A paper describes a structure:
Spiroviolene synthase (SvS) from Streptomyces violens was first described by Rabe et al. and represents a bacterial class I diterpene cyclase that we were not able to produce in sufficient quantities for crystallization due to protein instability. Terpene cyclases such as SvS form a variety of complex multicyclic compounds with potent biological activities via carbocationic, electrophilic cyclization cascades of relatively simple substrates, either by metal-ion assisted release of an allylic pyrophosphate (class I mechanism) or by protonation of an oxirane/ene-functionality (class II mechanism).
The variants could be grouped into four categories based on their substrate preference in a Malachite Green assay: promiscuous (I), inactive (II), diterpene-specific (III), or sesquiterpene-specific (IV). One representative variant of each group was subjected to crystal structure analysis, and Cα rmsd values in the range of 0.35–0.68 Å compared to the parental SvS-A2 structure indicated that none of the variants had significant conformational rearrangements. The single residue exchange Ala224Ile (group IV) reverses substrate preference of the reconstructed ancestral enzyme and enhances specific activity for FPP approximately 3–5-fold (Malachite Green assay/GC-FID) compared to the reconstructed ancestral enzyme. Spiroviolene formation could not be detected for this variant so that a ratio of apparent second order rate constants cannot be derived. Steric effects are also likely to play a role, since the larger size of an isoleucine side chain permits sesquiterpene binding while hindering the correct positioning of the bulky diterpene substrate in the active site. In contrast, the Ala224Ile exchange slightly increases both the melting temperature of SvS-A2 (from 71.3 ± 0.0 °C to 73.4 ± 0.1 °C) and of SvS-WT (from 58.2 ± 0.1 °C to 63.6 ± 0.1 °C). The Ala224Ile exchange reverses substrate preference, and due to its conservation in a functionally related sesquiterpene cyclase, we speculate that it may represent a general specificity switch in bacterial terpene cyclases.
Numbering used by the authors:
A (entry chain A): 9 to 89, 94 to 235, 241 to 311, 327 to 360
B (entry chain B): 8 to 89, 97 to 234, 243 to 312, 327 to 360
The structure:
Amino acid sequence: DLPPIYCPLESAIHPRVHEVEKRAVEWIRRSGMCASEEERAWVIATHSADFFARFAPTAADEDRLLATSLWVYWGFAFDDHGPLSTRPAQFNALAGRVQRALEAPSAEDNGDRFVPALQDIARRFRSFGTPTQVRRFVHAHRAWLSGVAWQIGNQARGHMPGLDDYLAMRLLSAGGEPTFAMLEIATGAEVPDREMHRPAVRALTEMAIMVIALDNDRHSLRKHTDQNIYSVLMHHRGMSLQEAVEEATKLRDRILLRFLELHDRVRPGAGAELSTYLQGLRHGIRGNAEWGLRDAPLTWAESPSDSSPSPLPGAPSIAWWWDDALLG
Amino acid sequence: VDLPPIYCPLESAIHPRVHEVEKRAVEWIRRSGMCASEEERAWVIATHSADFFARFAPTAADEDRLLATSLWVYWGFAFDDHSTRPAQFNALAGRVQRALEAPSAEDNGDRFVPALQDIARRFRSFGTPTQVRRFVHAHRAWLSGVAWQIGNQARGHMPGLDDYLAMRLLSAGGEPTFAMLEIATGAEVPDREMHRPAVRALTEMAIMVIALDNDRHSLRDQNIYSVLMHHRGMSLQEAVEEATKLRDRILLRFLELHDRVRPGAGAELSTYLQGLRHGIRGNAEWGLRVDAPLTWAESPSDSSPSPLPGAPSIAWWWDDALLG
């Protein structure tokens, strides 16, 4: 099992990653996010500065890379530590309160450990980004919390989503959206509304997010009714773990090929800011996989395990990624 | 039981082609396959939602954009009104929101999806992709609210004031409603103007006043009256007078900030802001009628310029230093 990852994309890391990691650890200790020192050590152990420094490896301002890096840490923390992990009614309200604290500086925590921390991140994002960029992050942020709400709903009932619902869900629950909405904030490069919201750019962003979500599901086979591509396929298709491992890799490789074919057609015409955003998507895909396999020599697959130029069978909710009349 | 007149010194108007739009919308609702029982579809038709939204965009040059936007209002009443346990809802919001963002998404026997996807297609043939994403994000924000409200209900959590006002911001469906003014008008608001805090604040304040006017339309399950009675130990009448003072103080702040922002605003942000105003008044007026003369309070029941205490989620509406 576990054949090497197909990832023919640029790998790079911010030359100031060590300095930014140092500050992030310091922020985390004063963040009051986590109860014990033992937990904070888990949050530090995510090496989320190493991670987000692979997405924005030429960020001119160490401060913007630090601010965005902080959210990746806050992100892990929020998701791991729960009592709410099969209590969707309570989570719906937590989600609402936390999302509100992101949009309303005046909002008060109510002994919620996470809120003041998020509110510090938000204060940073307003210092750096335009109100437009902040809203892009806020909206992405709620998108993610809708994903998590969906996933927690499923856990409560013991619902194993099928392929369509599972892929739809993970675009959101895996944190891809708020992660990519921080590119602009890290780099400074304000992508205009006309370009950022082209269907073709939306598709590329989702495809980037979906490959990262599937790389993460693969990364979580290093441990049975947990919600992941493997369980989904074993349930709905009657496959063995090994057969589903091969199917997962076929699907994921097909999405990545589409991402590269659409990138190859969009990028030539892209303006400077969109081009920088699109390099982030690529640096992100590769950075995720690389960060997941941790300077030991790493093996990659030279070819994909499936190169069908058409949409995924059984996943109509993503078929539009392949429809060029609806895009560019 | 005894209820004062509403303070609402805002322009009242309704699209001149409203009757022709209702005609077409009634017909789409018959051909929508949304509610099976015809009896149900009559409940939807009797929202008179075209009449509601014709008040928000009364000079909209294209009758088809006012039709498209009006369908969504019917859809929202139909979806929200008439499986809805929190766990199943989180999945249901997930799918419906995905069907709005992804035209290739397949109904899978859900009755609301094909109809929302028809609305989406119309929105995509009129609005720029920018205008559609604003509506999309607004639509999720509402679904997040309805999820919050369904959560509290199933657990027996009466929220405090702050939480209730935050929730209702979303669950009233004011965001998706106001995110349709641009799609009705065709007046493209540039991002540097739309995402100004000042404009966010004017948009949320219009939304909150609509949500609190809607609450007053229910004294005839979570509402400001229930919330204030539970957390402050008021009678129904102690809380009706308290609810009116919060609302009237929010609408005062709305008029104040509008008067600061409006002279500088460009043609398109200006159309939007008149849309906020037409919207608040339309909602109040539509609330009563659903047609002989209405009475209005000439004066606010509480003209304090300060932020509401015990509602820090909304205090920033009043902080000018933060509305650069």
